[PDB]
């Protein structure tokens, strides 16, 4: 159907192929703190390319887009359209780049029509927000050299061509020059240290101690903007709420206890967050969280541990690691750009990317977890540890049926970790590790323990499909006795040989006890043609470094 919509703008206008970039994506991104400033980075980033693509719609229509495909799209439909949406709009799905048909007179004009509307509303925000730090100088905090921080900050590349994928081609490597052409938290000018200020009189001004620079503090206002914009915010605040969704601890918790806990928790103080369920931070801490100079009665510390300690025995320890997911299409620069091939099959790629991003990522993640971002062949997402792997695999089968293959980072990490940190860590495992392997389709999955240690393994995704099938996997104490002596083998490599090495240890770990260890030996040889590798020593390690980390009782306990 999408045939007779390109030939009307390609015939009723006279008609220039638009080109949409917004240059600071991965950097605005991984300036963030706590989980809420991630979504709340992300989201807006998406709020601008809507914006952007506003002003195409406004002017024409909806079919006058090619990528990305607007059909869905819940800004649009909530936001353009006034539809009712639910929790839909809290998921970021536009990316940055896009591609419009637009009327070969306006193409001047939708440049500086875009690069202004951003701009108006991004200060729009700063000054929403400046008046919400206010409620929670202040008349110079809007001078026309902090405003520029705010329109200079994120630019807004736009570029055309008359009338081939040839074209295409021309049209991305002509606007992918204009880019780099055109503290806080970030190198960028705090809101206040700029003009003439003490870094000791900076922090003492700031609303938690940390001075925040313009762009952070659009940041921070943005979750209670998009509260009264939409009606709703994220179901999952901290990174703590979706740590505790491992096994359903915290909905157990959440009955057997809970109503006793808020009780012995409201008898302390007013802490009426995610981290009061572990007994650590009650005895680690509480200071930071004392915000007046009132008294804390200390049996009542003593024993919200005691209560805690003792659910514990009942229930389980506390989950205290989650999971970062970090997903992206490989080779695919140029599908989603359309060199690859403009036909209505660049509209079907871009529907077929939509229609997977909005329905079939969300359709996989499905409050088990944050989804925070699905820009068409990419995401990302705040997983619970036990649906890292399982949430990753059946997204990877899923782009499978709707461009090919797509790689992935999952870093695994303890909750009282540095974001920024980990952030950082999740990315360097998809680009630097996964998408660095030959046939690149691969899954990069870290643990990083809060020893400080750092496992890493780079998978194959057929690896996680023969391993639940896996007789394996039916054992996995033993295990424990088995992944360590293994490990320590080829911690350098074993002397004897990497053959002989796995049947000793199979071996070493009465008529089913023949068929069963010649049984694992398949399997441990057949996964490791999967596991990611340039020998057997290298695969070996790789195979046991994804059975060390997946059976952690740490981590997973
Ligand atoms: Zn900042």
């Known amino acids: 159907?999408?045939?007779?919509?390109?030939?009307?703008?390609?015939?009723?206008?006279?008609?220039?192929?638009?080109?949409?970039?917004?240059?600071?994506?991965?950097?605005?991104?991984?300036?963030?703190?706590?989980?809420?400033?991630?979504?709340?980075?992300?989201?807006?980033?998406?709020?601008?390319?809507?914006?952007?693509?506003?002003?195409?719609?406004?002017?024409?229509?909806?079919?006058?887009?090619?990528?990305?495909?607007?059909?869905?799209?819940?800004?649009?439909?909530?936001?353009?359209?006034?539809?009712?949406?639910?929790?839909?709009?809290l998921v970021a799905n536009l990316p940055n780049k896009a591609l419009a048909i637009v009327s070969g007179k306006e193409a001047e004009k939708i440049e500086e029509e875009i690069k202004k509307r951003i701009r108006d509303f991004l200060l729009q925000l700063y000054r929403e927000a400046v008046d919400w730090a206010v409620e929670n100088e202040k008349d110079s905090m809007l001078k026309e050299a902090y405003l520029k921080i705010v329109r200079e900050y994120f630019t807004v590349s736009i570029t055309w061509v008359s009338l081939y994928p040839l074209l295409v081609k021309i049209l991305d490597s002509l606007g992918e020059?204009?880019?780099?052409?055109?503290?806080?938290?970030?190198?960028?000018?705090?809101?206040?240290?700029?003009?003439?200020?003490?870094?000791?009189?900076?922090?003492?001004?700031?609303?938690?101690?940390?001075?925040?620079?313009?762009?952070?503090?659009?940041?921070?206002?943005?979750?209670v903007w998009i509260r009264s914009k939409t009606g709703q915010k994220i179901r999952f605040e901290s990174v703590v709420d979706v740590a505790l969704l491992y096994k359903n601890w915290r909905k157990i918790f959440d009955e057997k206890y809970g109503k006793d806990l808020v009780s012995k928790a409201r008898e302390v103080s007013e802490d009426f967050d995610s981290d009061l369920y572990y007994s650590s931070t009650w005895e680690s801490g509480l200071s930071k969280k004392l915000k007046?100079?009132?008294?804390?009665?200390?049996?009542?510390?003593?024993?919200?541990?005691?209560?805690?300690?003792?659910?514990?025995?009942?229930?389980?320890?506390?989950?205290?690691?989650?999971?970062?997911?970090?997903?992206?299409?490989?080779?695919?620069?140029?599908?989603?750009?359309?060199?690859?091939?403009?036909?209505?099959?660049?509209?079907?790629?871009?529907?077929?990317?939509?229609?997977?991003?909005?329905?079939?990522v969300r359709s996989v993640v499905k409050d088990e977890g944050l989804l925070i971002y699905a820009g068409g062949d990419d995401?990302?997402?705040?997983?619970?540890?036990?649906?890292?792997?399982?949430?990753?695999?059946?997204?990877?089968?899923?782009?499978?049926?709707?461009?090919?293959?797509?790689?992935?980072?999952?870093?695994?990490?303890?909750?009282?970790?540095?974001?920024?940190?980990?952030?950082?860590?999740?990315?360097?495992?998809?680009?630097?590790?996964?998408?660095?392997?030959?046939?690149?389709?691969?899954?990069?999955?870290?643990?990083?323990?809060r020893s400080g240690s750092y496992y890493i393994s780079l998978v194959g995704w057929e690896l996680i499909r023969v391993f639940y099938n896996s007789e394996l996997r039916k054992k996995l104490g033993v295990g424990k006795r088995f992944i360590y002596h293994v490990?320590?083998?080829?911690?350098?490599?074993?002397?004897?040989?990497?053959?002989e090495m796995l049947k000793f240890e199979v071996i070493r770990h009465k008529e089913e006890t023949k068929e069963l260890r010649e049984k694992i030996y398949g399997e441990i040889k057949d996964l490791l043609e999967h596991v990611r590798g340039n020998n057997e020593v290298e695969k070996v390690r790789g195979l046991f470094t994804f059975l060390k980390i997946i059976t952690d009782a740490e981590v997973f306990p």
Not at 197 to 220: A, G
Not at 488 to 496: G, I
């Open 1 to 89: 159907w999408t045939h007779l919509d390109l030939t009307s703008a390609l015939s009723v206008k006279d008609p220039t192929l638009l080109r949409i970039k917004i240059v600071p994506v991965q950097p605005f991104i991984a300036n963030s703190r706590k989980q809420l400033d991630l979504w709340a980075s992300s989201h807006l980033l998406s709020m601008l390319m809507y914006k952007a693509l506003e002003v195409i719609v406004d002017k024409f229509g909806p079919e006058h887009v090619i990528y990305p495909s607007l059909r869905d799209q819940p800004f649009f439909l909530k936001f353009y359209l006034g539809e009712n949406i639910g929790d839909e709009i």
């Open 177 to 223: 020059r204009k880019v780099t052409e055109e503290w806080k938290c970030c190198g960028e000018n705090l809101a206040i240290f700029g003009d003439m200020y003490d870094h000791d009189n900076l922090k003492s001004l700031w609303l938690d101690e940390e001075p925040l620079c313009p762009m952070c503090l659009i940041k921070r206002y943005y979750p």
């Open 292 to 360: 007046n100079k009132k008294e804390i009665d200390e049996e009542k510390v003593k024993e919200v541990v005691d209560f805690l300690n003792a659910a514990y025995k009942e229930i389980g320890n506390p989950p205290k690691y989650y999971a970062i997911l970090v997903m992206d299409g490989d080779d695919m620069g140029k599908v989603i750009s359309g060199e690859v091939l403009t036909p209505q099959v660049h509209v079907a790629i871009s529907q077929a990317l939509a229609n997977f991003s909005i329905r079939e």
């Open 487 to 499: 490990l320590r083998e080829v911690d350098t490599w074993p002397k004897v040989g990497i053959d």
């Open 379 to 449: 995401v990302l997402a705040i997983l619970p540890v036990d649906k890292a792997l399982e949430v990753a695999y059946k997204i990877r089968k899923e782009f499978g049926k709707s461009g090919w293959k797509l790689s992935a980072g999952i870093l695994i990490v303890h909750y009282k970790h540095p974001l920024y940190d980990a952030l950082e860590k999740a990315r360097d495992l998809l680009n630097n590790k996964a998408k660095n392997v030959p046939g690149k389709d691969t899954l990069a999955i870290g643990l990083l323990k």
